[model samples]
Target chain A: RHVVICGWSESTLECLRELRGSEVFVLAEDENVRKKVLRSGANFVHGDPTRVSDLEKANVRGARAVIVDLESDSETIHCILGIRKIDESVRIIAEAERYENIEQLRMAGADQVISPFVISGRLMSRSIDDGYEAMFVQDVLAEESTRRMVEVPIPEGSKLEGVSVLDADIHDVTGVIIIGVGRGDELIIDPPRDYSFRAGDIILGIGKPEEIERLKNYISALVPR
Target chain B: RHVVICGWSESTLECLRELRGSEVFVLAEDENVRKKVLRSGANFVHGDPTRVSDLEKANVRGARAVIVDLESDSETIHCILGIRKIDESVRIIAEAERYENIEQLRMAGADQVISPFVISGRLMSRSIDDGYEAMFVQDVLAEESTRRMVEVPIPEGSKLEGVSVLDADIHDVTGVIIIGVGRGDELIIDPPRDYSFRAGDIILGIGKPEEIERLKNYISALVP
Candidate 1:
């Protein structure tokens, strides 16, 4: 399913860059943002996202996800409510400048909401008071490393199941380090010998880009072609 | 400043219970939720929160923070957007069901977007894979007793400054154990006795709720 993005900001550009080859459609009002979106290899539509007609022009019906990145709080809320009217099933993500506007955005039909400034401020405050390791140690940021960290979601009936960390032969075969294991709500750090792999586990491995690619391919090959 | 919550589900009621005796205003659409909110001793307003007119009746202008808890994704978003139109500065916390929708919710202007189900699922998964001690060691859980947990920011001029975990007398004052020291990008787990606490450093501690509260108060009192 295609994801519909409604703004052209740095975050949007970063998202597009990350999902470069994915099926994403951009609906941006700014010419520069629209150009960037178009250049990033995603479908682009130029229009005011707050307006229902403009959103429809961008084919809101076909979108599985919608991201509203408007600057104005009122506009963001309006866009959320407007999108809800068109497709109630479509997931809505919105941005707010002020913390107070979050409720209105949710009431307007946004499924998820975030304030970049607030989050940044929170992170900064934590860094200043707690330390960087404290932030990185959290589940949200713990997997980050100098080398790329590839997250592999263990598929059902995969050979990786019942395999111990040492026996997995990840280093020799994929040239990566299994930094952490995410099972249910816990993160196992440097697991001991008895720890066994299970289906639906998300493994966090750190290594060079090529090594990660090889690992991905090997895991994908486990289920056949 | 007092917080105002609109709409009450099981989650909303639980939130109200958490804020019990605190200055809070509740606007609930369901009669049962309204009864519970009232029983919790919070001010109550019975109305459909999705409507701007109804929100206006509930006095959305003066609230410090507003929490929107509705069943339908569409209704919750509509209510939040409408409230934003009315008051541009109110702090808002919203809820969601899916992970993919987080970005959309951020764009729509929510200050904080939470998916309790996803978080709970992640917690469960992490518990099963890492074991209970690993979970505590990782400090992923929000509870006070979690050995390696993050605490909220300390206000200006707090007493924790210049105090090392070994010298802070945390065990005597709060009956808590200090597990790690986070300073900027560096984390010193089981820091040595000579290590000193900086102004902004968050002291990772493990203790009972009452002890944590004592430590929090002591730290708050240090702020100039």
Candidate 2:
């Protein structure tokens, strides 16, 4: 019913800030972490994140998603395995110390691996090429920005079903451009106009918040409950 | 004429990969760093990067850009100040250990501060809310992706000197959408129709490589 955050790092609090609107529980090994975790507007469950008994204490089975950012990759891998053992359906987002460990962490059952080195490396690389370009990217991704990247899934029995991307009239109606189509494991970038919509397809779009809201409303109006 | 990478870390090689086509020189403190730096397609200069003499040895004065990722923020700050003393115009990109240190590093004269924790934290936050949304972002930013974000500056006296954004017809001509207008220190997102392009303004767009190439050609054709 809530998100379970495993481990604590400089990123944990920042991560908590983004999940502010959602119910979250922080699993920490230290008792002193309660104050800070609570201060960040989350429940603190003190225990070894790698242990099943400790994870159960945090109700990992009931978690909608789990964010693991332990000190080491080995520990994060073990934590993922432990969580999967209890609930295979939960989304597990793990952090990796080294970019090379990303595959291994994914193999350990993490749905996604967040690598600080790789992330920063790409940004630094972009910065080196064009300073303001990287900053523009940061601005686009920031929580407070007027423009952002949005992901929306087209569900079954929707009016938009079977309609080709070109005829969907997304941009004209909502000002949001569909950049890519996420179908299963494949991400189709700059999708062809003949590429029609299918149920369960997720659209990757870029636009302002108001525009995105318009898109959501447009999609919702077409979708039958 | 080259980019200087100051310090060494796990990210150094990754950073080097991004600047693969550019002439780069890595300034490292250890003598043993030569093999890796040279192997990664960059010139290696061994020295204490915080010293002006060492920077001179690396010819920091003539560098186009300087990437600082030292072992400590203090060392990185000192290195930036040292580089500024020699050349005030070189682009300085420094990595900060903490997000709080970003301003301090900027004040130290770094044009950009890359913080791993903050960057990763933002992605992680986005992931928590929407998983594939963040992955989509990564795909868009990836070097090998078919679609990418591009920044092109509109020079003065160009054919597009006084054209409004709508009048530019960028998307129709090149399939690239101008999402934001970068004017001086401000980023105008989803610019208004009447927002005309001014010389020295940068257009931040998203499109396929071919589309961007066409855009570059269009801008070039317009400029003169």
Candidate 3:
């Protein structure tokens, strides 16, 4: 699916870089931004974003997601209205400046509205509660994140403690995969299938949060025999 | 000590409503904001914040914290420069736009520079790991969260479960105040001083994060 990004905010660049495995393009008015998008190996169409013709020039009508992040709140509202008229089906995700404009964006047909402080403040607070695992959760589960990491420990009461990873067949039970062992603070990433599980070794699980949770619960013996 | 807010962004309003106490003043250019500030029972100085005279009119020199949050990045930089020249020692905190301008704000003399996305990105990531508690933590923290909440279970293996709140004296031990207690799913806010810690009770220690950690460790016997 083709994704379109408008504006030149720092977070916009972060979104562009973080956007994984999709055909992406940029529509910017700034000359420096054109150089940036082109240098970064992206399709660039330079012109006023508020104008429908300029957006059409960037082929926004074919976009799966059109991310609009401009400087002025009014400009964002104006651009969203223009994008909606051009392509009503394209998902318009916008970065809002004020709380007042959130509803305005919605009324103008923005599918999603994001504010940086709201995103950052929420994450900073989560770190306080969950510790470092919060960042790991972010990478694996966040809507835009690109990496994956999860760990499940072997309880003393579990029968699978002394066995190797080959017979584990985690994918059969929980539909998740275990490719490593965390012995104490050490990470044994991509360990051989013959590697045996120690009494305290924590298995590394990958895939969805729900699947990982099932694996964790199964390992904890809370799921029952 | 008074807090001076420079811009009228949503975070600014959140800061004002969350400020709780201590006199706060708004330095804004918008006329509509003057009415909003006045309606909120605050002193509003309506003038160009980028101008030195306007900031002085708000008495920036005596401010405890001067927050600068303008629309334009360069304008924010300009406002910081003006505020610094007006009050060299006053702490200036600013919200920046781009990533590279972080050091630029520092060089321009901003005591603190926050890029909203950087704050929001980490927070959005955290909301994924922990569901409700992350939101609760965000509520209690993130910006100058002076008072914090810490949980200390009346350990099932310990003998202190039957003790009264007064004798607990967490204030004396760790400079933290137990403003509330979590009894199972029930939250007892500002329970009477005569209240005692029961089995499965959680102390709601209020203080700095470090103090809360101390109180948690103390009650758990880890810091004893």
Summing lDDT over every window of 10 consecutive residues in candidate 1 chain A, give the lowest-scoring window. Answer: A121-130
Best by DockQ: 2
Q: What's the TM-score of chain B for every model shown?
A: 0.69, 0.92, 0.63
Q: Flag the better candidate by lDDT, 1 or 2.
A: 2
How would you encode candidate 3's per-residue C-alpha lDDT over B136-183 as one tens digit per residue? Answer: 333334445555444556676444566776687766687675545666
Chain B, candidate 2: TM-score: 0.92
Ranking by DockQ: 2, 3, 1
Residue B206, candidate 2: alpha-carbon lDDT? 76
Q: Please identify which of the two predictions, 2 or 3, would achieve the higher lDDT against the true structure.
A: 2
Lowest-sum lDDT 10-residue window in model 3 chain A: A124-133
lDDT of 3 by residue, A92-145 (tens): 777777766778988988766666655332332222212222233233433443
Order the candidates by lDDT, highest first.
2, 3, 1
* Each model's lDDT: 0.62, 0.81, 0.64
Q: For all candidates, state DockQ relative to the true structure.
A: 0.04, 0.57, 0.11
Instruction: Compose the digit string of candidate 1's lDDT tens values, residues B39-113.
Output: 876788888888888887777876676777676777778888878988988877776655566676677777766
Q: Which residue segments of model 1 deviate by more than 4 Å?
A: A1-225, B127-153, B161-205, B220-224
Candidate 1: C-alpha lDDT? 0.62
Prediction RMSDs, each to the true structure: 13.6, 2.6, 13.4
lDDT of 3 at A23: 70
